[PDB]
Design a protein around this ligand. Sequence first.
Ligand SMILES: Nc1ncnc2c1ncn2[C@@H]1O[C@H](COP(=O)(O)OP(=O)(O)O)[C@@H](O)[C@H]1O
Ligand SMILES: Nc1ncnc2c1ncn2[C@@H]1O[C@H](COP(=O)(O)OP(=O)(O)O)[C@@H](O)[C@H]1O
Lengths: 712, 233
Amino acid sequence: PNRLIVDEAINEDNSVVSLSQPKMDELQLFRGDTVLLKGKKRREAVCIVLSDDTCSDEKIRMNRVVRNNLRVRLGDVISIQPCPDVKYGKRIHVLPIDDTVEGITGNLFEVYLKPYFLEAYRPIRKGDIFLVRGGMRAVEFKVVETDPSPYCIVAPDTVIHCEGEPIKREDEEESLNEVGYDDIGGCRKQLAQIKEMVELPLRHPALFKAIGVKPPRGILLYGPPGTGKTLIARAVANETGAFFFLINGPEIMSKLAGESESNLRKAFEEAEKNAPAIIFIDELDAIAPKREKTHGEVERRIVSQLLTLMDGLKQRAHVIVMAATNRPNSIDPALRRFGRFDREVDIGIPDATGRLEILQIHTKNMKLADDVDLEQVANETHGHVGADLAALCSEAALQAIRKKMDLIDLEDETIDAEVMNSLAVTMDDFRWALSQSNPSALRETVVEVPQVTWEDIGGLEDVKRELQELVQYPVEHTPSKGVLFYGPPGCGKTLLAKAIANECQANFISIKGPELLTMWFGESEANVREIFDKARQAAPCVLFFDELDSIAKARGGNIGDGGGAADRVINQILTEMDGMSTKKNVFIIGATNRPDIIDPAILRPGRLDQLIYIPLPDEKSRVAILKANLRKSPVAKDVDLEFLAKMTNGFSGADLTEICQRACKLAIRESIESEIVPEIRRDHFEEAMRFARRSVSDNDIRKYEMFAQTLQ
Amino acid sequence: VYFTCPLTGATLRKDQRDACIKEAILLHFSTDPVAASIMKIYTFNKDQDRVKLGVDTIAKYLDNIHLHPEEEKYRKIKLQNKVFQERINCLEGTHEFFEAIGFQKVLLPAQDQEDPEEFYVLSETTLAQPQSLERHKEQLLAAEPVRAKLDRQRRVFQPSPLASQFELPGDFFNLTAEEIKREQRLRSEAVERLSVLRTKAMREKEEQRGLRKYNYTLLRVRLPDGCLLQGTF
Ligand SMILES: Nc1ncnc2c1ncn2[C@@H]1O[C@H](COP(=O)(O)OP(=O)(O)O)[C@@H](O)[C@H]1O
Ligand SMILES: Nc1ncnc2c1ncn2[C@@H]1O[C@H](COP(=O)(O)OP(=O)(O)O)[C@@H](O)[C@H]1O
């Protein structure tokens, strides 16, 4: 009773914790009441309690600053003891920690402590450590004297004193600038997977010493450079308390024969002595490259030594080995056998949401101007990884620094806190840095939740329901795990696959003709296994195979070369599909404009069992399509969209879009010419009608109808 | 949460509010039948949109006879009329109001049928002085539902420093087998929930489970002099 498990914070503020409301009702404390938290080693901290809709009934959410003051870690238990007797303070004395006040001078109170405490009414206790961010520096302070004891509320009428040399950090105190879970932006799912596998054997060693079954011995983190592979490994070690040993390929390979292998096995011995511990091996492909690709004795012997060291982990209790690589297929396959490194996690490239969170983390110490919009930046930074967003914030800061430092002119060993705190980074400084920055992962495939929703697709009301049923039924109640769309081009085949991914908040993986053709022409169809493996790692996701017959067309389509219906890639697709379960949360959607020439195997039971016909839209749907296409622009009241729909009887959705964009092209030109009118007028649509034509002939509709009648 | 009934002065809980007020209104008929039926029409009926239409239609019947008090065709209100049945007959207390302001319930021959129909017929005693019905019409239209007043229960408390003095057991921080298995199960379920491919309707069904717990609040104020002030809203 009155005890909860320590969990991650949602509110980043250092003076507050969040409880689930039912526990506040049992403790009979209100939102905003001051409570004490009882931690390990007879230590306590004072904070304010609130509540939210996400905290578990049996957990307390507190950030790193509060956990460090209690000397507790995630997964521990603390007691909550309300203390309504807390009074307002009269005088407090707060001094900085030397580790964070180096190179900076000036009046720390006016810059940091004053706005931090002013009108905040934060609880304070003697011995507390708390962090105040600003001036592009993270400065933490320790409380050395409080006139009331042992804690109070710091009110606007409380005297705040700060005189004396910075305090040297104690050996039992950890720096708040060390990487933890709050420093990781996107890839929350991947971090959760690591938690499940790693935190338990490190937080509770006694659980696994009593049994003959070992926890996972190695985890392989892969993805482009700069995505957080090392950051996750360090954050987990720092949050659980396990000793972190850093190894990398170049450090071992740069050594001479004998010394190289000695250093590798010595690090493993040190981890055992310091167990529990995590051994992180960076550039695994450099320390353990495929042996069949090299003739050197050093490379082969190091691989053999690493293989035996991994096996020795059954004796080195509580040591977990993690490795980082670019691709699981760029390392010697022996490491990936049962045991050793038999768990793989795809870190990937952050999406627009993840990129925003990463920028918000980096700017924690930065003062941003009112015109700065990090969401807009995250949308523009396509192809960037966290390492590039870190450089982006640094470059934006340096540009802002130069602009004002030319006016500050402070040339000394330290820089005043006031002149740094007055510096703000503007939108022009981020845009400048964006123009100079170059993404490191631009050529890599970017997989994210699409922005196309059901309101963007005109007509097809029944197809929308069918897709929702195919995904919802196996979860609400052998259900099919894929559907093929057939029919005329430009009717929404791709949009349907995106819209269902959107509503499900699922990742959308787009496979287009050129990619299917590249695998065919280059005899690299093995990449299909990586596509399906990406779909599994990206789950929940929708794996969309567009232009399924693109290779058949490349081979002649209606004529044909050495092949016909089946090819290298579709057969690899069949291979992977037959190994995928309905419980993998991967929904496979295909699309073709020539369903008569696709390998019939793909439609056999257990594969793409569902087939949906997408005909040309009817009259009411064509109106809906025009309205959806024009939802982003001003349209005059004289525009009769129903009249246009009545004329465009044979037009596809793609053809109606051309009309809308042509009307936009004319409307925008008139506006530009007038400036050198503000809305799209009927005259612009009537002119567009003079050029727009239907792309789907009547004979092509008969071809699709006959196929639909074949299946019924 | 406590309330005061404005018709009796009784102290009630949140569930006892309608029971006491309804009983007080039904008893009030012994003092002022018109005021009691007016309270019943607004208080007993939960659908206030129908109450507004009911009292507006009743006001129109009264103004019709007020304009032409010499014509007998405005003295009788037909209980089987489509408008009366939908707006007035569907409410509790509207029949009591008609009787309270001088209408008798009688059966009159129909202008085109043998079967007598139900009418509220104004008596000559009240018809002679339209000023009585005009005042009763305004008393009905200006009325509101009767609800128990929320008791603020103003209290001040003095915290006792002794409540903050407690020492934990030495084995407090040692988690049990159930606490460790539960936490690892929640970790596996949290990873699974992120992995599940589901539609928005399935997502909302679970998220919506946290939305209905409270309709009252207790507020406290921390005062500079160390006093804790509390009240109910
Ligand atoms: N997912 C991420 N979330 C937050 N920061 C990230 C992320 N990925 C990379 N970074 C940032 O980029 C840098 C990563 O550099 P480094 O420590 O060499 O790790 P790695 O090269 O393995 O990604 C750090 O500054 C880190 O904060
Ligand atoms: N049903 C529809 N509703 C709205 N717009 C559509 C529809 N069908 C096609 N379009 C328009 O056609 C364009 C191409 O659609 P897409 O689904 O990419 O065609 P395909 O699947 O044949 O490649 C889209 O940008 C969209 O504006």
